[PDB]
Amino acid sequence: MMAPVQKQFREFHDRIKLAQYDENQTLRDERDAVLTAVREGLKKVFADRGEAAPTFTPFNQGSYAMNTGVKPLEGGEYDIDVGIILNIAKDDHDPVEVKKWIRDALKDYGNGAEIRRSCVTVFKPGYHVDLAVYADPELSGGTLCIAKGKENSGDEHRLWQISDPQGFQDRIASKLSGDDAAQFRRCIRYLKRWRDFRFSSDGNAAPLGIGLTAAAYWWFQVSKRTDPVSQNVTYDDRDALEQFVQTMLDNFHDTWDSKDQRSYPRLTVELPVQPYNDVFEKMTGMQMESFKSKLQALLNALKTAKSRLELHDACKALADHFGSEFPVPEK
């Protein structure tokens, strides 16, 4: 019979997983260090304006909130995502200015902050902290809005955009339960490691993380077998990946670009909560074309790894796409 690869996938998962905030004191302390720095820095920033400093409530975001986090490859960075809800009315402030408050509060913290379009990012050895900045729903008419725009942006691109990070997190947590949900999370992690191994450490692959998470929300399906007599359950991560990758490939659509006078294959993945935006929208057509090609190569490898006699060969085919922490037994 063909060599199975489930034990190797579970070993691979053990190597790449990074514990979520609730189980990771190091991440909680690094998060809280950035949060304490912003409180102190705001004291100083606003004593300088004759105004009382604003208060904020933080909340966990991203993969370390959703338990979909992976360890970076050597040289890569961890990504601590957090939301802060300032006690301010959105109609009374420009979003970029509010993010300036936060950046200035984190001037002399670590490697200094940086105002990015959707967050303030502070850099420290081996990780960065992505602070998404929101206005208070109570003071802003009932809705939760994130500060969009950077110092580069014109008036068209400075806005307070409706956002539902807790509804998104709830949907990821609630789609499945128990060991079904564990396999869902494993497969998200496997594809994040594939991202880090086969796409560059620049931001062209920056939307892959959230994109693959939202893709899995729409399209992942469990693969397990239940013995009709013993009721014993075994999971098949290789097959779950094969079905999911094939479904992603099925949803690419050839999309004409009038500027370039050609089509590019594009995968649109809507966020399942507000603002329902295509989380892959920033990827260029040429990057989409490369993404599709690499997903197809991954799919071909997943199929090859089903049909090898030797476990070494099945695992080698997988490690060509998942990298050198995918275990490959000797022949």
Residues belonging to the binding site for Mn(2+) are: 79, 81, 130
Report residue 304 as tokens: 């090859």
Q: Which residues contact 276 (CB under 8 A, 6 or more apart)?
A: 270
Is residue 83 close enough to count as binding Mg ion by CB under 5 A? no
Task: Indicate the residue among 88 and 115 with the shorter CB distance to Mg ion.
Answer: 115
Task: Indicate the residue among 41 and 62 with the shorter CB distance to Mg ion.
Answer: 62
Task: Indicate the residue among 283 and 301 with the shorter CB distance to ligand ATP.
Answer: 283
Q: Classify the phi-psi angles of 83: left when phi > 0, otherwise alpha if psi is within -120 to 50, otherwise beta.
A: beta
| Residues annotated within a binding site for GTP | 63, 117-119, 134, 192, 195, 277
Q: Residue 248 CB, nearest distance to ligand ATP (Å)? A: 16
Q: Residue 7 CB, nearest distance to ligand ATP (Å)? A: 25
- Interaction partner, residue 95 (Mg ion, ligand ATP, none; CB < 5-8 Å by kind): none
Is residue 30 close enough to count as binding Mg ion by CB under 5 A? no
- Omega before 54 cis (within 30°)? no
Percent helix, percent strand, percent coil in the chain, to nearest 5: 45, 20, 35
Q: Which residues contact 5 (CB under 8 A, 6 or more apart)?
A: 238, 305, 311, 314, 315, 318
Is residue 237 close enough to count as binding Mg ion by CB under 5 A? no
Binding site for ligand ATP (CB under 6 A): 61-63, 69, 79, 81, 116-119, 130, 132, 146, 163, 165, 168, 192, 206-207, 209-210, 213, 271, 277, 279, 282
Pairing of strands 78-86, 127-135: parallel
Pattern 85-124, binding to Mg ion, x per CB under 5 A? ----------------------------------------
- Interaction partner, residue 274 (Mg ion, ligand ATP, none; CB < 5-8 Å by kind): none
Q: Residue 63 CB, nearest distance to ligand ATP (Å)? A: 3
Closest CA to 53 of 62, 63, 42, 64: 42
Task: Indicate the residue among 129 and 305 with the shorter CB distance to Mg ion.
Answer: 129
Is residue 196 close enough to count as binding Mg ion by CB under 5 A? no
**Are the CB atoms for 100 and 130 separated by under 8 Å?**
no
Q: Would you state the torsion angle of the CA atoms of residues 28, 33, 34, 36, taken in this order, to the nearest 10 degrees?
A: 120
> Coil, helix or strand for 253?
strand
Q: Residue 192 CB, nearest distance to ligand ATP (Å)? A: 6
Is residue 130 close enough to count as binding Mg ion by CB under 5 A? yes
B/e letters for 164-186, b = 16+ CB within 10 Å, e = fewer, are: bbeebbebbeeebeeeebebbbb
